[PDB]
């Protein structure tokens, strides 16, 4: 919307690029905001559609997550990097509401920029947003609903299906619902003296393309992606109480410390010194084999020198794997991770307490890839999910689709209070802020009234991607929510409405409780706070100064 550029003044000189001041900066900030905003508008909601990006090497990426889309876009505009880093902050902390926080923060900038031309001061505009946000949080606490009279895991099953919507797994969300709920409950641990916490990424995601996505098997235990060192080793361990050895010590021919220079005056010493180099490693592996360990995990590669004794003893060898993957194996099976093998005494020894326990250790071949399936852990339970699709590019989307579903369920068990989703909160916050600021009024009434209509961009965008009539659905959301705000808590009726609406599939207003769509209260909070700081930082900028690189 910027034409004629700007006239360079000779009385004002600065090294580097020219300095632009006035309304041109806020016009370019909104122009740069709507550039990244229109990308995530079509990807929002179950009726939304994602976009594709070319990496210039021929490979592409198909994902519905707004964080990955903005991460792949490198924005040269200074204020444009705020919304890009806002999506990376959203999925890292809460893990949900990534597309919504970008659209909400975009509408806050579009409406506030139009208010600046109204001559109201930006700090008064910011004050209107912060005062309205303080009361909006109090309204979120009033609409909280604690799960009660629910049968089994249906509470977590219905909430997990909300995050599965808008993504390729939404059609299969019925089958994938039981896999995600059972995945985070198996990794359940205890910390902070009684506080329940869950690990992130602890559930392994394996990519094997074949069969169908509905046939994906849920392994009752951890699965590790690695290839066996020697093909002569058994791929299946029969019998219970399988001992797993988690070790960071590789078995290889190793050079002595660089600060040592061997000087020998006799040729006869060349036989014993060369033999002892391999003999030192033999002392460590000999005590491990005598302990009866069936599977020995190793962080670093193992040369064929020590792999001979593993074949005779029927011990399965392992080579380089991720360091963070071997930690949860020892904790689940009861083993203790050993970075360097040593004892309190000055003599080397091996204790049986460092060996894990499980039901069995088997290696299953999915397509042409081979992975180890560890089932029936002893000390702590674990889980893994093997995603199946038509091509590897669909598996890349299902990984982020599964990772986003784990973050929503993780925040669900931390706070028992949940709020209805599907544009119900955004429609409820509009009317609550309409009656607000009417008592104070004065100048701040206009800035607060625009903040209420700014949250309407979320429910209106959902109806556009569905190829339906938006004004018909928006008029209904304002009809039920408006008249019920004054209700007195007896004679019932009344507030029984306003708790539901905006169903994109059938285009009708239906109850979200019977539908099953719900959202955690953690995803709603901190989303407007992060979107506010992104709006305040950009709105306060009168002048942008660019310096040419050296």
């Amino acid at each position: 919307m910027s034409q004629l550029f700007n006239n360079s003044r000779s009385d004002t000189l600065f090294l580097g690029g020219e300095k632009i001041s006035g309304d041109d900066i806020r016009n370019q900030n909104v122009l740069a905001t709507m550039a990244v905003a229109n990308v995530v508008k079509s990807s929002l909601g179950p009726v939304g559609l994602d976009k594709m990006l070319v990496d210039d090497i021929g490979d592409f990426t198909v994902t519905n997550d707004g964080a990955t889309i903005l991460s792949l876009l490198d924005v040269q505009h200074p204020a444009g990097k705020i919304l890009v880093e806002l999506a990376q902050q959203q999925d890292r902390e809460i893990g949900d509401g990534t597309t919504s926080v970008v659209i909400i923060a975009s509408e806050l900038l579009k409406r506030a920029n139009e208010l600046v031309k109204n001559k109201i001061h930006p700090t008064t505009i910011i004050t209107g947003f912060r005062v309205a946000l303080r009361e909006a949080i109090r309204f979120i606490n009033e609409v909280l609903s604690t799960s009660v009279d629910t049968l089994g895991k249906e509470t977590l099953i219905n909430i997990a299906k909300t995050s599965m919507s808008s993504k390729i797994i939404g059609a299969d969300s019925d089958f994938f619902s039981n896999m995600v709920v059972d995945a985070l409950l198996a990794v359940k641990t205890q910390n902070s003296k009684g506080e329940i916490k869950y690990p992130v990424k602890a559930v392994n995601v394996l990519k094997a393309h074949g069969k169908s996505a509905t046939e994906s098997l849920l392994v009752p235990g951890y699965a590790l992606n690695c290839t066996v060192a020697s093909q002569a080793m058994p791929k299946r361990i029969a019998g219970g109480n399988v001992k797993i050895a988690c070790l960071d010590l590789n078995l290889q021919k190793a050079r002595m410390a660089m600060g040592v220079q061997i000087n020998i005056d006799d040729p006869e010493q060349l036989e014993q010194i060369r033999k002892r180099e391999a003999g030192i490693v033999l002392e460590r592996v000999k005590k491990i084999i005598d302990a009866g360990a069936q599977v020995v995990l190793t962080t670093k590669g193992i040369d064929d020198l020590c792999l001979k004794e593993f074949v005779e003893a029927k011990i399965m060898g392992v080579r380089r794997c991720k360091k963070e993957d071997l930690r949860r194996i020892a904790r689940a099976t009861g083993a203790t991770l050993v970075s360097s093998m040593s004892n309190l005494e000055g003599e080397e020894t091996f204790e049986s307490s460092y060996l894990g326990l499980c039901d069995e250790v088997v290696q299953a071949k999915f397509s042409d890839d081979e992975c180890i399936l560890i089932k029936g852990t002893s000390k702590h339970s674990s889980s893994s999910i093997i995603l199946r699709g038509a091509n590897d590019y669909s598996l890349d989307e299902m990984e982020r689709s599964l990772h986003d579903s784990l973050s929503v369920v993780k925040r669900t068990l931390e706070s028992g209070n949940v709020v209805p989703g599907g544009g119900c909160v955004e429609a409820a916050l509009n009317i609550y802020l309409d009656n607000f600021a009417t008592t104070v009024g004065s100048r701040e009434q206009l800035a607060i009234a625009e903040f209420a209509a700014a949250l309407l961009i979320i429910p209106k965008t959902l109806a556009v991607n569905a190829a339906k009539d938006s004004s018909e659905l928006v008029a209904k959301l304002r009809s039920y929510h408006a008249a019920s705000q004054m209700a007195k808590p007896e004679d019932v009726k009344r507030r029984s409405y306003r708790n539901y609406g905006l169903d994109l599939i059938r285009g009708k207003i239906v109850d979200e409780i019977h539908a099953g769509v719900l959202e955690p209260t953690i995803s709603k909070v901190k989303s407007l706070k992060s979107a506010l700081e992104a709006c305040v930082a950009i709105l306060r900028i009168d002048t942008m100064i660019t310096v040419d690189p050296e």
């Binding site: 009726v47 990006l53 490198d74 060349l270 010194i273 001979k308 038509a390």
Partner: protein, 520 residues
């Protein structure tokens, strides 16, 4: 300007149209590659070689296609190959037609893609039940039944003339690798090829075929009962991890250094002679000093061997790889070797190791092939990998699906009957699936030179009344039944064709906009 973006942005309905047109062109090239009369496609690689095959997997692999949507069709080739290995051409043709036939709408009806996706998920579930009902189980222990089953993938290839000989090579190769459930893998099957010769003279021989001649002239090239021992360590003098740096004060110490190097290697040779092996195989290079003490005791020396061949030799003779010479024992020495011989061929020498054939570890075997040139060998090798993969599905899945296009047409008839009973808004996407399933048997008619209008009209009518085994004849282009046609195909091949094609179509329907050249 802003970031990396804009240029020409394709938005609206034309972004999905560009995805349908580009993906449709992928199946149009290999459209003539389906059927027994299918032609061949010659490919030109940047390396300077030549690839001539009718298999859609190898055709779409070497061809470089630059397009966001069209590359997704290229990835579907390795989905059918790595999971099964048969039907790669059928999946691309089916998935290419589904996107065009099942979703022409949104150009006209303006139907949302997810609404179509919800109908494709219900159509995939019903399509699997139809295949299960038309599938008749077959005995896996019948040798005569497995021969006609392997010829299914052979009928569309060039080896159909040798199909009587080819079924003998594929049956003995899969049965040997099969280990007792009955899990086999092609990593132990050897693809090694012999240039020239007669195809009828090619036979599967147990053991590993080595290209290396014996090292010393006095090494026996004929042994009745060879005893093989595998050594990973080289017979040369190991320098060590750290430098020795001998300080020699007196002139007598330097001669002892070179004297021990002869005695140190001799010490490792004396430990080998304890088990008196007839054939010694070393993974790394061997010194000319170590071969003398091994020749005196009767041992045989060979050239350095790759790690891939060491695993196959240990399976044939039952030997165990022994790195440490001092730990070598008689228990790890390979036995039960039928014959050891070396035949002269102008290109290279060839060493033969025969198995005594008489539970334990799975046996390994190599497939010898005599072609007319170097490129003909690579074509039959791809034909054997497709033919031997058929025997893997019947062993794990005894169910046997109808072939000759009868599987896809049987689903199209059942979907048309349930389309009118379903009604609703999903009737159009659900009924459009039956139109995409009948394109595969329609291709068989176009390649045969018949009239697809009159043949497919009588095919649907005779399918309900006559039987579910009615299909299109490849050679005569007539209406025949698969019962008298004598050739069938496993169900795993048909299940992978329906699942992969539908699951891939749902990915392209969700595409909104396309942005190219963002960054690396």
């Amino acid at each position: 300007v802003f970031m990396n973006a804009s240029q020409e942005r394709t938005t609206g309905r034309q972004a999905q149209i560009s995805n349908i047109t580009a993906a449709k062109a992928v199946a149009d090239v290999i459209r003539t590659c389906l059927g027994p009369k299918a032609m061949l496609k010659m490919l030109l690689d940047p390396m300077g070689g030549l690839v001539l095959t009718n298999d859609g997997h190898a055709i779409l692999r070497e061809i470089d296609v630059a397009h966001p949507a069209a590359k997704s069709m290229l990835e579907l080739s390795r989905t059918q190959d790595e999971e099964v290995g048969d039907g790669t051409t059928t999946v691309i043709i089916l998935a290419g037609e589904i996107l065009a036939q099942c979703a022409p709408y949104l150009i006209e009806k303006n139907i949302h893609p997810v609404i179509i996706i919800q109908a494709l998920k219900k159509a995939l579930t019903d399509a699997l039940e139809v295949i299960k009902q038309v599938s008749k189980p077959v005995d896996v222990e019948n040798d005569a039944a497995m021969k006609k089953l392997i010829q299914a993938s052979i009928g569309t290839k060039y080896v159909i003339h040798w199909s009587e000989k080819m079924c003998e090579l594929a049956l003995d190769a899969v049965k040997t690798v099969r280990k007792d459930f009955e899990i086999d893998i092609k990593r132990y099957v050897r693809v090694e090829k012999i240039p020239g010769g007669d195809v009828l003279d090619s036979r599967v021989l147990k053991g590993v075929l080595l290209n290396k001649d014996v090292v010393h002239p006095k090494m026996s090239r004929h042994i009745e009962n060879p005893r093989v021992v595998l050594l990973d360590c080289p017979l040369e003098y190991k320098k060590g991890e750290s430098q020795t740096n001998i300080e020699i004060e007196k002139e007598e110490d330097w001669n002892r250094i070179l004297q021990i190097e002869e005695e140190q290697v001799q010490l490792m040779c004396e430990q080998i002679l304890a088990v008196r092996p007839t054939l010694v195989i070393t993974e790394k290079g061997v010194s000319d000093l170590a071969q003398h003490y091994l020749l005196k005791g009767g041992c045989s020396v060979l050239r350095r061997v790759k790690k891939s061949d060491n695993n196959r030799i240990a399976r044939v003779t039952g030997a165990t790889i022994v790195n440490r010479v001092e730990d070598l024992k008689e228990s790890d020495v390979g036995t039960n070797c039928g014959l050891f011989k070396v035949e002269m061929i102008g290109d290279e020498y060839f060493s033969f190791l025969d198995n005594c054939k008489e539970s334990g570890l799975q046996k390994a075997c190599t497939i010898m092939l005599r072609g007319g040139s170097k490129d003909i060998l690579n074509e039959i090798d791809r034909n054997l990998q497709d033919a031997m993969a058929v025997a893997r599905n019947v062993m794990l899945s005894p169910s046997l699906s109808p072939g000759g296009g009868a599987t896809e047409m049987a689903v199209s008839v059942k979907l048309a009957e349930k389309a009118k009973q379903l009604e609703g808004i999903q009737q159009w996407p659900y009924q459009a699936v039956a139109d995409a399933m009948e394109c595969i048997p329609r291709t068989l008619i176009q390649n045969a030179g018949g009239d697809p209008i009159r043949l497919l009209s009588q095919l649907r009518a005779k399918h309900a009344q006559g039987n579910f085994t009615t299909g299109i004849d490849g050679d005569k282009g007539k209406i025949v039944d698969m019962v008298s046609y004598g050739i069938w195909e496993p169900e795993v091949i048909k299940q992978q064709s329906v699942k992969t094609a539908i699951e891939s179509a749902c990915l392209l329907l969700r595409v909104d906009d396309i942005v190219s050249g963002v960054r690396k």
